[PDB]
C-alpha cells in the first residue's frame, strides 16, 4: 500500500568470528562487490 | 574601454630568414600549469627512440621536479603554414614561421608496477578483490 | 522546353548529354542519396497543390520503365500479366532463336 | 511520505581523479563512519556527496522526447502540420512524428517539433 | 525563346523526355561502364 514496492537488504554479520578473525590475507569478500555478486545472482538465478 | 574603442594600424614583415627554428609547445589547459614554478628546465630529445623527428623530453625543476613528454603532430604545413606574430618596439609586427607542433603531456613519478613477474599470471587468477599488496611485496 | 529544342539542335549541331549534365537540371543519383531525397513519380500530377499531401519533392523519375531490364522491356503491359511469366519470358527470351 | 512524490536524486555517474582523470571509487571510513571516494592507481581520495552510489534497471521514461535536435525540421520529407502555435512561438509549421526507434513506440502518437525559427521546441499532444 | 524570366511550357510534354532519353543513349550508350573500368 506504500508509494512504491522496495526491498532493502543486509548481510547477516553474526557478531562473532565474522570480524577479521584469522586474517588469511585474501579478503574473503569485500562488501560493495558482494552486493553485486548477490544482485548478479539475485536477478539471473532465482525463479519465483 | 580600448578593447571596444581603440583603432590602430601596424606594419607586417615576413623575414626570409631567422637565427632559430620556431616550434610550438602546447600544454593542456586542464592542468593549469604555473610557469612561475618553473625555476629551471631541461629539454632533450626522448631516448626511447634509442633527431629532428625525436619527441622532446622536458625536465622542469630538476630531473624529477617536473617531467613531460612531447609528441610531434602529424602535420603542420600540410595545407596552411602557421605563423608567430610578435610585437616590436616600433609597433610594427614581425611574423615567424612555425616549424613543428609537439604535444606535451604530464608524467607520473616513481610508482613501478612491473606486471611481468607474476602479475600477468596473477590476472589469470584474479577475482577482482585485491591489488595493493603486490605493490608492497616489491 | 527550350532545352528540349537544344536536344533537337544536337541531332545536327551539338548539345551533349554531358551538357545536359552540365546544365544541372538532372543529376546522377546513388541509393544513399535516395534515402534523403523526396522522389517524385511524375512531373504532372505531383506538382498539383489541390491534393498536395506533400510537395516537398526533390527529384523525379525520367520514366518508370527505366527500372526494366533488356528482357522485360520487350513485353508490353507486363502489369496486365502475371509477374513470374515475365521472368519466364526473360529466361525464355534468352532461349529464343534469332 | 506519499504516493505523489518522485525519485529524481540526480545520480552521479562518475567523478574523475584530479591526479590522473581516472574514476574515483566508493569506500567506507569505518573509523569516521563516512563514505569516501578514491582512485585506485593513486592515493587521491575525497568524501562522497551522497549516500546513493548505484542505480539499476533502466528505460522506463520518455527518451524519444529527448535526444532529438530540432534540426530534423529542415528535412522536407518530414511532414509539416497545419496545426498552429509552437508551444512557444505563435507560429505553425510544427514538425511531427512518432517516437520511431527501438521501443519504436507502440506509441503511434504524434510528437511535435516546431520548425519556426526561435523556438526549437520538442513536444507532443 | 528565352526571356530568362518564366517557363513558357509548364506543361513540358511527357514525350520530350524521350528526346532526353535518345540523347542519353546518343552520348552515354549502354555498355560504356564496362570500358570505363578497363580504361582507367
Ligand atoms: Zn587517481
Ligand atoms: Zn516554434
From Swiss-Prot, chain A:
Changing residue 1 to S: In NEDHIB; uncertain significance; severe; no effect on cell viability. It comes from the Eukaryota. It is found in: Nucleus; Cytoplasm; Chromosome. The tandem heptapeptide repeats in the C-terminal domain (CTD) can be highly phosphorylated. The phosphorylation activates Pol II. Phosphorylation occurs mainly at residues 'Ser-2' and 'Ser-5' of the heptapeptide repeat and is mediated, at least, by CDK7 and CDK9. POLR2A associated with DNA is specifically phosphorylated at 'Ser-5' of the CTD by CDK7, promoting transcription initiation by triggering dissociation from DNA. Phosphorylated at 'Ser-2', Ser-5' and 'Ser-7' of the CTD by CDK9 (P-TEFb complex), promoting transcription elongation. Among tandem heptapeptide repeats of the C-terminal domain (CTD) some do not match the Y-S-P-T-S-P-S consensus, the seventh serine residue 'Ser-7' being replaced by a lysine. 'Lys-7' in these non-consensus heptapeptide repeats can be alternatively acetylated, methylated and dimethylated. EP300 is one of the enzyme able to acetylate 'Lys-7'. Acetylation at 'Lys-7' of non-consensus heptapeptide repeats is associated with 'Ser-2' phosphorylation and active transcription. Regulates initiation or early elongation steps of transcription specially for inducible genes. There is a cross-link at residue 18 (Glycyl lysine isopeptide (Lys-Gly) (interchain with G-Cter in ubiquitin)). It comes from Homo sapiens.
Swiss-Prot record, chain B:
Induction: Up-regulated in response to enterovirus 71 (EV71) infection. It is found in: Nucleus. It comes from the Eukaryota. The modification Phosphothreonine is found at residue 114. Heterodimer of an alpha and a beta subunit. Interacts with GTF2F2, CTDP1, TAF6/TAFII80 and URI1. Interacts with GTF2B (via C-terminus and preferentially via acetylated form); this interaction prevents binding of GTF2B to GTF2F2. TFIIF is a general transcription initiation factor that binds to RNA polymerase II and helps to recruit it to the initiation complex in collaboration with TFIIB. It promotes transcription elongation. Belongs to the TFIIF alpha subunit family. This is General transcription factor IIF subunit 1. It comes from Homo sapiens (Human). The lineage of its organism: Eukaryota, Metazoa, Chordata, Craniata, Vertebrata. The chain holds residues 5 to 180 of 517 of the full protein.
From Swiss-Prot, chain C:
This is DNA-directed RNA polymerase II subunit RPB2. Signal peptide: none annotated. Catalytic core component of RNA polymerase II (Pol II), a DNA-dependent RNA polymerase which synthesizes mRNA precursors and many functional non-coding RNAs using the four ribonucleoside triphosphates as substrates. Pol II-mediated transcription cycle proceeds through transcription initiation, transcription elongation and transcription termination stages. RNA-dependent RNA polymerase that catalyzes the extension of a non-coding RNA (ncRNA) at the 3'-end using the four ribonucleoside triphosphates as substrates. An internal ncRNA sequence near the 3'-end serves as a template in a single-round Pol II-mediated RNA polymerization reaction. May decrease the stability of ncRNAs that repress Pol II-mediated gene transcription. Belongs to the RNA polymerase beta chain family. RNA binds at residue 95. The lineage of its organism: Eukaryota, Metazoa, Chordata, Craniata, Vertebrata. It is found in: Nucleus.
Swiss-Prot record, chain D:
Disulfide bonds: none annotated. The keyword Ribosomal protein does not apply. Zn(2+) 1 binds at residues 17, 20, 39, 42. GO terms for molecular function: DNA-directed RNA polymerase activity; nucleic acid binding; zinc ion binding. Zn(2+) 2 binds at residues 86, 89, 114, 119. It is found in: Nucleus, Nucleolus. The keyword NADP does not apply. It comes from the Eukaryota. GO terms for cellular component: nucleolus; nucleoplasm; nucleus; RNA polymerase II, core complex. A zinc finger (TFIIS-type) spans 82-124. GO terms for biological process: maintenance of transcriptional fidelity during transcription elongation by RNA polymerase II; transcription by RNA polymerase II; transcription initiation at RNA polymerase II promoter; transcription-coupled nucleotide-excision repair. Keywords: Acetylation, DNA-directed RNA polymerase, Metal-binding, Nucleus, Transcription, Zinc, Zinc-finger. A zinc finger (C4-type) spans 17-42. The modification N-acetylmethionine is found at residue 1. It holds the Pfam family Zn_ribbon_RPB9. Belongs to the archaeal RpoM/eukaryotic RPA12/RPB9/RPC11 RNA polymerase family. Core component of RNA polymerase II (Pol II), a DNA-dependent RNA polymerase which synthesizes mRNA precursors and many functional non-coding RNAs using the four ribonucleoside triphosphates as substrates. Pol II is the central component of the basal RNA polymerase II transcription machinery. It is composed of mobile elements that move relative to each other. POLR2I/RPB9 is part of the upper jaw surrounding the central large cleft and thought to grab the incoming DNA template. This is DNA-directed RNA polymerase II subunit RPB9. The gene is POLR2I.
Amino acid at each position: 500500500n506504500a508509494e512504491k514496492l522496495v526491498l532493502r537488504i543486509r548481510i547477516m554479520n553474526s557478531d562473532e568470528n565474522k570480524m577479521q578473525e584469522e586474517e588469511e590475507v585474501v579478503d574473503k569478500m569485500d562488501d560493495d562487490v558482494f552486493l553485486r555478486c548477490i544482485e548478479s545472482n539475485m536477478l539471473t538465478d532465482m525463479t519465483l | 574601454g580600448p578593447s571596444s574603442q581603440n583603432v590602430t594600424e601596424y606594419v607586417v614583415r615576413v623575414p626570409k630568414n631567422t637565427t632559430k627554428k620556431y616550434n610550438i609547445m602546447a600544454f593542456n589547459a586542464a592542468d593549469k600549469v604555473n610557469f612561475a614554478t618553473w625555476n629551471q628546465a631541461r629539454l632533450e630529445r626522448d631516448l626511447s627512440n634509442k633527431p629532428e623527428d625525436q619527441p622532446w623530453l622536458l625536465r622542469v625543476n630538476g630531473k624529477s621536479g617536473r617531467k613531460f613528454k612531447g609528441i610531434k603532430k602529424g602535420g603542420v604545413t600540410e595545407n596552411t603554414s602557421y605563423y608567430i606574430f610578435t610585437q616590436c618596439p616600433d609597433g610594427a609586427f614581425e611574423a615567424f614561421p612555425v616549424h613543428n607542433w609537439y604535444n606535451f603531456t604530464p608524467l607520473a613519478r616513481h610508482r613501478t608496477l612491473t606486471a611481468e613477474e607474476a602479475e600477468e599470471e596473477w590476472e589469470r587468477r584474479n577475482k577482482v578483490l585485491n591489488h595493493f599488496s603486490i605493490m608492497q611485496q616489491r | 522546353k527550350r532545352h528540349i529544342d537544344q536536344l533537337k539542335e544536337r541531332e545536327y549541331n551539338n548539345y551533349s548529354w554531358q551538357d545536359l549534365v552540365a546544365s544541372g537540371v538532372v543529376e546522377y543519383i546513388d541509393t544513399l542519396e535516395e534515402e534523403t531525397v523526396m522522389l517524385a513519380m511524375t512531373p504532372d500530377d505531383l506538382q498539383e497543390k489541390e491534393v498536395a499531401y506533400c510537395s516537398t519533392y526533390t527529384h523525379c523519375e525520367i520514366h518508370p520503365s527505366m527500372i526494366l531490364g533488356v528482357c522485360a522491356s520487350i513485353i508490353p503491359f507486363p502489369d496486365h500479366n502475371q509477374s513470374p511469366r515475365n521472368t519466364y519470358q526473360s529466361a525464355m527470351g534468352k532461349q529464343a532463336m534469332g | 511520505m506519499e504516493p505523489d512524490g518522485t525519485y529524481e536524486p540526480g545520480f552521479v555517474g562518475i567523478r574523475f581523479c584530479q591526479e590522473c582523470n581516472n574514476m574515483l571509487y566508493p569506500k567506507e571510513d569505518k573509523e569516521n563512519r563516512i563514505l569516501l571516494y578514491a582512485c585506485r592507481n593513486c592515493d587521491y581520495q575525497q568524501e562522497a556527496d551522497n549516500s546513493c552510489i548505484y542505480v539499476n534497471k533502466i528505460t522506463h521514461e520518455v527518451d524519444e522526447l529527448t535526444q532529438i535536435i530540432a534540426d530534423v525540421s529542415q528535412d522536407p520529407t518530414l511532414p509539416r502540420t497545419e496545426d498552429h502555435p509552437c508551444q512557444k512561438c505563435g507560429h505553425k509549421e510544427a514538425v511531427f512524428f512518432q517516437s520511431h526507434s527501438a521501443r519504436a513506440e507502440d506509441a503511434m502518437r504524434l510528437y511535435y517539433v516546431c520548425t519556426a525559427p526561435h523556438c526549437g521546441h520538442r513536444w507532443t499532444e | 525563346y528565352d526571356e530568362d524570366d518564366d517557363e513558357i511550357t509548364p506543361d513540358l510534354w511527357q514525350e520530350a523526355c524521350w528526346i532526353v532519353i535518345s540523347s542519353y543513349f546518343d552520348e552515354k550508350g549502354l555498355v560504356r561502364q564496362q570500358l570505363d573500368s578497363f580504361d582507367e
